Design a protein around this ligand. Sequence first.
Ligand SMILES: [Ca+2]
Length: 240
Amino acid sequence: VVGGTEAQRNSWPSQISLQYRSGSSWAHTCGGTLIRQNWVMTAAHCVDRELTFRVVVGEHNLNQNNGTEQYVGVQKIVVHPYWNTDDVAAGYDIALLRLAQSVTLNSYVQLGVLPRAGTILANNSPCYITGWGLTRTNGQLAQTLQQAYLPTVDYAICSSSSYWGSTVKNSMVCAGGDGVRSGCQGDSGGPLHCLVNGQYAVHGVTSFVSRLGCNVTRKPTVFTRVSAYISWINNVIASN
Ligand SMILES: [Ca+2]
């Protein structure tokens, strides 16, 4: 997250860290959202490599023991059947992960609230992006969970010429674009939390930023629109 601030330890309890095994060690690659005690929603492109992955819930500082984390392996990865690696601009950047074990819910580990199917937010709705991704374009990962206020840019404006044009589809949400705050590499897969009727719901799975950089004026961070996938999510979780 570029332009962010450190989140309080108990603010975003559905945020997870998706990590891969690197020799004898583990490294953070993406965020994700806990949606059942044994299912995590993340971006399909995060699990494109054939790596060994684990999920860390209750995580705050990637590099020190917080005393609140649970570490669990990944037993099954289900990516959307329509996901194309060579076209993130085509959409369907979403994947479900069932965990080898159910995690324990407490005030650092909670389920994310998903929107009702089809819900679209008003232009410039209040949302926060969270993650451990790069704190600058071509920078390095944050050690502590960051957050940043990222208001939505609706489909008509975000698919206009001056913003992303044709690169964005209506199965996506745009948020940000002020040139200061944004998602960045390592944030992919994580939540866009938006306040709707006094409740925060996870409306976006972070998908991509501009090839020019993370925080680029009029290139908002693009997210998979979770409310376009509610039937797919429920159908996967009911069958697996
Ligand atoms: Ca830690």
